[PDB]
A paper describes a structure:
The human leucocyte antigen (HLA) molecules, encoded by the major histocompatibility complex (MHC) region of the genome, are cell surface glycoproteins responsible for the presentation of both endogenous and exogenously derived peptide antigens for immune surveillance. HLA-B*57:01, HLA-B*57:03 and HLA-B*58:01 are micropolymorphic HLA allotypes of the HLA-B17 serotype. Polymorphism within these allotypes is focussed on regions of the antigen-binding cleft (cleft polymorphisms in comparison to HLA-B*57:01: Asp114Asn and Ser116Tyr in HLA-B*57:03, and Met45Thr, Ala46Glu, Val97Arg and Val103Leu in HLA-B*58:01). Notably, residues 97, 114 and 116 contribute to the E pocket of the antigen-binding cleft, whilst residue 116 also contributes to the F pocket.
To do so we chose two 9mers containing Arg/Lys at P7 (PΩ-2) that formed a natural part of the HLA-B*57:01 peptide repertoire, LSSPVTKSF and LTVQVARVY, and designed P7/9 variants, to utilise in thermal stability experiments. LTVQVARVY was not detected in the repertoire of HLA-B*57:03 or HLA-B*58:01. Consistent with the enrichment of P7Arg by HLA-B*57:01 alone, the P7Gln mutation (chosen due to similar enrichment of this residue at P7 by all allotypes) reduced this difference to ~4 °C by increasing the stability of HLA-B*57:03 complexes and reducing the stability of HLA-B*57:01 complexes. As a consequence of these substitutions the C, D, E and F pockets of HLA-B*57:01 were the deepest and most negatively charged of the three allomorphs. Arg appeared at P7 of 9mers (and PΩ-2 of longer peptides) almost exclusively in the HLA-B*57:01 data set and correlated with stabilisation of HLA-B*57:01 complexes by PΩ-2 Arg.
Numbering used by the authors:
A (entry chain B): 1 to 97
B (entry chain C): 1 to 9
C (entry chain A): 1 to 276
Amino acid sequence: IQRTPKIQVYSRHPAENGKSNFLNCYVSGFHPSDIEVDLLKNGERIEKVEHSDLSFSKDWSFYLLYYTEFTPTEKDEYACRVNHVTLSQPKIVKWDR
Amino acid sequence: LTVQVARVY
Amino acid sequence: GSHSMRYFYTAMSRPGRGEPRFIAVGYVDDTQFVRFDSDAASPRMAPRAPWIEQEGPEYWDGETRNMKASAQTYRENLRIALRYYNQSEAGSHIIQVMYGCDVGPDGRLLRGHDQSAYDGKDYIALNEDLSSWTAADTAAQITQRKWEAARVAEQLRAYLEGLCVEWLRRYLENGKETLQRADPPKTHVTHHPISDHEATLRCWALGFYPAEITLTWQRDGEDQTQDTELVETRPAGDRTFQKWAAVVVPSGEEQRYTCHVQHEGLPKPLTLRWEP
């Protein structure tokens, strides 16, 4: 009756420190549709993150893209935090270039 | 353009 | 090439939190061009692609009225479905609908679709003949008997053969700079040792459109399907998509592996390797 989200965290363009980019968290394959997604910069929630309009794949599972403008550096850590009814606790996926 | 056909379940 | 138009409706009940949410999105191929959300401050069919914006007030007003009506219809269908499955009014449920048409290079109807799910499971589907139905269970059989009585399939067929294809053609012409452009993948292979005698080879495809792509690893010319890690194709946010395929290989045998890339934007399939 329920399906846990697949989570990918990645950038729109190949990461280059000091160059502006987009941080993406793509959540997919989940059901039902209610889901909570935060983008984290060094553990802290990034404000005003946008997301795509709810849609679904041919197997009826939902997908959403959350995204925000960011400028990657050497020290700064980025992550995606996802909560869903199938998850007992928020799942955090660290961004890996 | 969306469909306009009566489909009550 | 070939093209498709698809609408996706999601209707979600939420007892105690108002009437069911209704969201509709429209796509040509992998390009979203309209949206409707009943939870928006002022719900209306709204543009999501540049080439749809030229449509006049009558288009947006008509589509808005229709999406409001469809929202009402699927709220009612949520209540009905509650009755069909002997379920209580305490729980939240979802009806999903996907419908639309596929046309070939000459714009002729290749095939039509109208299918729905309840709580993520198949409910009812218009068969390829666009004249009969496949119901997934006895509830959906009730709906099927209703739709056979009212000859709904005939009306859907009329839509899918007529307006659906005509308007898809119109959209394809208006957005031909993008909808009729394939962007080939930018490809490369990365190499990361995991140990002294194993290394990951990762074959990357970036910036391609449409989303349909095939990435495969071969070892000595033999497909490594069972041993290949394949991530879901993912949107970059600039209309294009990304994907990779990874294989764990014995150190010193990297050159025995080849990555094969198939995409509409490529004249011929690509073969690439790790280049140290």
